[PDB]
Amino acid sequence: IDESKIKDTVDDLIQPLMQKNNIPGMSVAVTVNGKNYIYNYGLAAKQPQQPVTENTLFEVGSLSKTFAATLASYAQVSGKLSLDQSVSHYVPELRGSSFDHVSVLNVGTHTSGLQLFMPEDIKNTTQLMAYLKAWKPADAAGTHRVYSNIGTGLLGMIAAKSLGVSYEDAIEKTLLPQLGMHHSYLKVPADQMENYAWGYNKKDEPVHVNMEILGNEAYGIKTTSSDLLRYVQANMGQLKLAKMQQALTATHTGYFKSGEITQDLMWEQLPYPVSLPNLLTGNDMAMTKSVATPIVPPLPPQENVWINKTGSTNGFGAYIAFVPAKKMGIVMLANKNYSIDQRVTVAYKILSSL
Numbered sequence: 001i002d003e004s005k006i007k008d009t010v011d012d013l014i015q016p017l018m019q020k021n022n023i024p025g026m027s028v029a030v031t032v033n034g035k036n037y038i039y040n041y042g043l044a045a046k047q048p049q050q051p052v053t054e055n056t057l058f059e060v061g062s063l064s065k066t067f068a069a070t071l072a073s074y075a076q077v078s079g080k081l082s083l084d085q086s087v088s089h090y091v092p093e094l095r096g097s098s099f100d101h102v103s104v105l106n107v108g109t110h111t112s113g114l115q116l117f118m119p120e121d122i123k124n125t126t127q128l129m130a131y132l133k134a135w136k137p138a139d140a141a142g143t144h145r146v147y148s149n150i151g152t153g154l155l156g157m158i159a160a161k162s163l164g165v166s167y168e169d170a171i172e173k174t175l176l177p178q179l180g181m182h183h184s185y186l187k188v189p190a191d192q193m194e195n196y197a198w199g200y201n202k203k204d205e206p207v208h209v210n211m212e213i214l215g216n217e218a219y220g221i222k223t224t225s226s227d228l229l230r231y232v233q234a235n236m237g238q239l240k241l242a243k244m245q246q247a248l249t250a251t252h253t254g255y256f257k258s259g260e261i262t263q264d265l266m267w268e269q270l271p272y273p274v275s276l277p278n279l280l281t282g283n284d285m286a287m288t289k290s291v292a293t294p295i296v297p298p299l300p301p302q303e304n305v306w307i308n309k310t311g312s313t314n315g316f317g318a319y320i321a322f323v324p325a326k327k328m329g330i331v332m333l334a335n336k337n338y339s340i341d342q343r344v345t346v347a348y349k350i351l352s353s354l
């Protein structure tokens with residue numbers, strides 16, 4: 001009977017949300033009391049029409065950053081990576097540059113000072129390294145938070161190299177298989193292309209994300225809501241799957257305070273019980289610089305917190321939130337990018353109903 005009540009709550013919020021934002025398709029996955037509920041709505045593609053099903057793959061954009069963090073954490077608990085070491089310690093071509101004074105932790109917490117977007121002209125590793133060797137932050141690393149795809153890219157690159165593999169092999173051959181996420185990909189295979197939803201951009205054109213340099217680390221994941229709910233459950237220790245569980249949990253370590261949030265290793269967290277005003281403010285930090293204050297010793301992974309991450313691409317919008325103390329979590333996937341405040345408000349209303 002709790003299943004029907006949850007479905008009513010979700011239906012009543014998602015259907016008006018899709019109508020007013022012209023979202024073609026959504027999947028919403030909820031976990032509570034050890035049980036999983038998956039609700040699918042609308043169309044994965046308009047023409048030819050295809051419904052959202054249990055197998056539908058969505059782009060998740062910036063949610064991909066948490067997989068780079070999980071990989072770095074795995075390297076750390078495996079003794080291959082020290083987060084307090086400098087980036088140039090692991091990337092010898094950057095020795096003598098600004099990255100002598102940037103830690104791996106800094107790129108894992110958006111405190112290096114690197115900008116949000118990769119310069120558009122950077123196509124290959126030679127161009128990337130020339131940019132990084134010439135780069136200087138406006139403030140000292142560790143003093144401000146600037147959300148960065150470039151920093152995330154370095155975090156994943158360094159983690160993979162420390163494990164002896166490419167980032168693509170690290171994710172698709174080790175991390176996702178060991179998490180049981182068998183319908184999660186950086187590159188969708190031919191037998192799954194029929195399941196890969198189209199995204200609909202601001203002009204309502206069908207689009208798929210273009211993968212550029214260090215893009216897999218920052219925005220490359222395509223996945224089902226069921227696989228992401230497994231990822232949420234693994235982050236709450238609910239699944240058998242010991243290094244992997246240690247790695248997942250350690251990504252929730254709190255390293256910096258900024259505004260309303262605690263910045264973990266890519267994950268962000270808020271106090272629980274959660275204030276909706278503070279949750280909205282905390283999810284409006286992607287494009288501006290803020291002051292960052294270190295938490296030292298770091299805050300251990302907590303139960304009594306709201307942990308979350310947003311993601312989008314030109315054609316998709318995604319959100320994950322979970323509260324370990326209540327073993328509850330939510331995944332919301334859509335094939336239109338609609339505003340973060342609406343994602344977070346719907347998620348807050350669903351989890352508050354439980």
Ligand SMILES: C=C1CS[C@H]([C@@](C=O)(NC(=O)Cc2cccs2)OC)N=C1C(=O)O
Nearest residue numbers: 061062063149218219286310311312313314
């Ligand atoms: C406001 C934000 C939050 S942050 C988000 C995000 C992660 O979701 N976009 C992507 O991952 C997909 C990419 C598009 C171009 C390079 S990447 O990070 C840039 N984008 C934006 C944006 O308005 O562009």
